[model samples]
Target chain A: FVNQHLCGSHLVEALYLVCGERGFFYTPKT
Target chain B: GIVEQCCTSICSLYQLENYCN
Candidate 1:
């Protein structure tokens, strides 16, 4: 469910932006 | 406040974007 949306470009870009802030980064488990 | 708000909003956005599909 949630995984499907997160894989999309928009959310992925958001994740990247959030990661740039300070204390986070994202890596896909698969 | 910042942490809670940011965390919640981001998480909410993630789930909101997610659909049952």
Candidate 2:
């Protein structure tokens, strides 16, 4: 449960980072 | 919890080095 939440949050953060850098494009994989 | 567990463990290992000094 903890790992799942952690993994999801990390991917979400990464998605935001990439989107912020170059605008939204792809969905981050879980 | 990543930082809580992993970072804490890493810091603990480094602290052990300090104890050796």
Candidate 3:
């Protein structure tokens, strides 16, 4: 169940997508 | 941390604590 009182998945995905479009500059090797 | 690392942090902000778990 999701907490409707908070942010959603699309928001997270969209934010990341925006950053990705600009390029994932930091290639922090795991 | 790789590209997915970005998403994990974002998910955490949205309360998806287990998103990367």
Candidate 4:
């Protein structure tokens, strides 16, 4: 089970690394 | 690809986008 809260710029950085800066608006499917 | 790995507690980037703001 996942139990943690992420907010603010931390979340933004996560988004960038995870999805953003990867492609247009679509993430590659694995 | 990358999303499935580091996403751990997060799955939806869109939702996270809203929540972050």
For model 2, name the residue pairs that clash: none
Candidates 1 and 4 compared by TM-score, better number: 4
**Tens digit of lDDT per residue, candidate 3, span A1-30?**
542222334444533443444432322343
Please give, as one word, the docking class of candidate 1: incorrect
DockQ for model 3 equals 0.13
Please tell me which model should have the higher TM-score, number 2 or number 3. Answer: 2
Model 4 chain A, TM-score vs. native = 0.30
Please write out the lDDT profile of model 1 over residues A1-30, one tens digit for every residue.
532223334544544454444423333332
1 or 4: which has the higher DockQ? Answer: 4
Q: Which model is ahead, 1 or 4, in terms of lDDT?
A: 4
Query: What is the per-residue lDDT of model 4 for residues B1-21, given as tens digits with 9 covering 90 to 100?
Result: 433433444456564453332
Per-prediction CA RMSD (Å): 11.7, 14.0, 9.7, 10.2
Error of 1 at B17 (Å): 17
Cα displacement (angstroms), candidate 2, residue A1, comes to 24
Model 1 off-target regions past 4 Å?
Answer: A1-7, A21-30, B1-21
lDDT of 3 by residue, B1-20 (tens): 33244443523333233222
DockQ of each: 0.05, 0.03, 0.13, 0.13
Which stretches of model 3 miss by more than 4 angstroms? A1-7, A21-30, B1-21
TM-score against native, each model: 0.26, 0.25, 0.24, 0.30
Model 3 error, position B8 (Å): 22
Model 2: how far is A15 from its true place, Å?
A: 0.8
